[PDB]
């Protein structure tokens, strides 16, 4: 199971590569290797810019 909050490519770490996937997904691209279950970062039931912003916050921290 994916136990890393924000690890959209399932490589163990949360970094800029996950931000790119989140951005491409929100744009409507088909992202290779993305974990769609990890997109709702804040767990509010939707996938939107707020999830992207919390992902950017986690990476900066």
């Amino acid at each position: 199971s994916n136990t890393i909050l924000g690890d959209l490519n399932d490589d163990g770490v949360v970094n800029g590569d996950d931000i790119v996937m989140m951005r491409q997904y929100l744009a409507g691209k088909t992202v290779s290797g993305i974990d769609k279950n990890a997109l709702d970062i804040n767990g509010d039931g939707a996938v939107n810019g707020r999830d992207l912003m919390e992902l950017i916050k986690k990476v900066s921290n």
Partner: protein, 141 residues
């Protein structure tokens, strides 16, 4: 209260029309905007959705995301990738919506509606900013 407003435009069937989306009453620097604008897909096709780079900075680092994959809905997301250096801090035009009017479109008004349930405006720390939305329309002539 920060306000996201869709403008109005008139055009003949077959014409390409441009509609501005404006933000006003800005004070707290804005780090995040999520808004959805619905339109009549039987009458209009989205040609593009372009940011006003005079106000929306760092578009080269993907600060302005558009999604038009769902018929009749435009989703616009602004995020400051730096969380500090490229906020929206003044009033102005956020983006321009270019529509192509179907050559068989009927005359009359057609609303451009902002979804209040999904509208988000927040500061650089992802804290909510009191917001409101104002709808626009296209008038086929």
């Amino acid at each position: 209260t920060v306000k996201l407003s869709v403008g109005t435009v008139s055009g003949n069937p077959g014409d390409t029309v441009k509609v501005p989306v404006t933000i006003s009453q800005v004070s707290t620097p804005v780090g995040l905007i999520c808004m959805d604008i619905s339109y009549d897909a039987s009458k209009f096709t989205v040609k593009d959705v372009l940011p006003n780079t005079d106000l929306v900075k760092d578009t080269d680092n993907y600060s302005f995301i558009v999604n038009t994959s769902t018929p009749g809905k435009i989703s616009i997301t602004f995020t400051d990738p730096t969380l500090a250096n490229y906020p929206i801090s003044v009033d102005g035009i956020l983006a321009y919506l270019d529509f192509i009017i179907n050559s068989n479109a009927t005359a009359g008004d057609s609303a451009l509606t902002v979804d209040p349930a999904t509208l988000i405006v927040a500061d650089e720390n992802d804290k909510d900013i009191k917001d409101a939305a104002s709808n626009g329309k296209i008038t086929v002539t």
